[PDB]
Amino acid sequence: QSPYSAAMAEQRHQEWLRFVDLLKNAYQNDLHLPLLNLMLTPDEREALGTRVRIVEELLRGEMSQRELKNELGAGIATITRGSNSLKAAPVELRQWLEEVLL
Amino acid sequence: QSPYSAAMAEQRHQEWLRFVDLLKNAYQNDLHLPLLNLMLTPDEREALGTRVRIVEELLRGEMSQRELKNELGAGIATITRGSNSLKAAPVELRQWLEEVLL
Numbered sequence: 001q002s003p004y005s006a007a008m009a010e011q012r013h014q015e016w017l018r019f020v021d022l023l024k025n026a027y028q029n030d031l032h033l034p035l036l037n038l039m040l041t042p043d044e045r046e047a048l049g050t051r052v053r054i055v056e057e058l059l060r061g062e063m064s065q066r067e068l069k070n071e072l073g074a075g076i077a078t079i080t081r082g083s084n085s086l087k088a089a090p091v092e093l094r095q096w097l098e099e100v101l102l
Numbered sequence: 103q104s105p106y107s108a109a110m111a112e113q114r115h116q117e118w119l120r121f122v123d124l125l126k127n128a129y130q131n132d133l134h135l136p137l138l139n140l141m142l143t144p145d146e147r148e149a150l151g152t153r154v155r156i157v158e159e160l161l162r163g164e165m166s167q168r169e170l171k172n173e174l175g176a177g178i179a180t181i182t183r184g185s186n187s188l189k190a191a192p193v194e195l196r197q198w199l200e201e202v203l204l
């Protein structure tokens with residue numbers, strides 16, 4: 001699975017997959033909310049909420065550098081993270097976000 | 103929604119819900135993996151993977167304090183976080199995890 005199959009890496013990788021599957025199930029059972037609440041800190045949840053917006057406004061292409069930073073709290077670093085992260089996503093996600101966010 | 107409806111709080115709260123819904127959709131479209139990859143840092147993913155284990159072993163009731171800390175990296179604080187977090191979950195999640203993790 002992992003781009004570097006060792007045993008430790010692979011393990012960490014599988015544990016992540018185990019989380020994904022857990023969640024998938026949670027959704028199927030309408031237990032997603034409470035699960036995510038359990039698994040994440042308040043601050044992490046808040047951060048996820050914000051990243052959606054950052055992702056949102058990056059796709060939109062209206063908000064400027066100073067705008068992102070001052071209104072959403074995104075400076076060169078964060079906007080760098082968000083950006084390359086967007087470039088790294090397979091095109092299908094990028095297409096989907098367009099339809100869905102926008 | 104929020105246990106303290108203001109405007110700022112509620113807003114933050116809704117943004118989180120917007121994330122939940124996004125993800126729900128992603129799952130429905132088989133775009134969950136790439137989405138989560140986009141939305142989370144490597145370290146956050148790793149942490150999620152570990153929390154599953156911590157949650158796992160807390161439910162199981164075999165692993166001791168020293169064991170959790172030394173094997174899973176969980177000291178009094180983390181095990182405190184994990185614990186009260188478990189107590190805070192509605193009983194339906196607690197029941198479900200039993201069936202599913204165990």
Ligand SMILES: N[C@@H](Cc1c[nH]c2ccccc12)C(=O)O
Pocket residue numbers: 051054055078079081082083085139140141142143144
């Ligand atoms: N996948 C991103 C996670 C993240 C951090 N900050 C963000 C801002 C916007 C979107 C995603 C992000 C990265 O690993 O760095």
Ligand SMILES: N[C@@H](Cc1c[nH]c2ccccc12)C(=O)O
Pocket residue numbers: 037038039040041042153156157180181183184185187
């Ligand atoms: N909901 C937990 C998130 C968390 C932190 N560390 C954990 C360890 C195990 C399970 C959950 C957690 C809390 O807010 O603190």
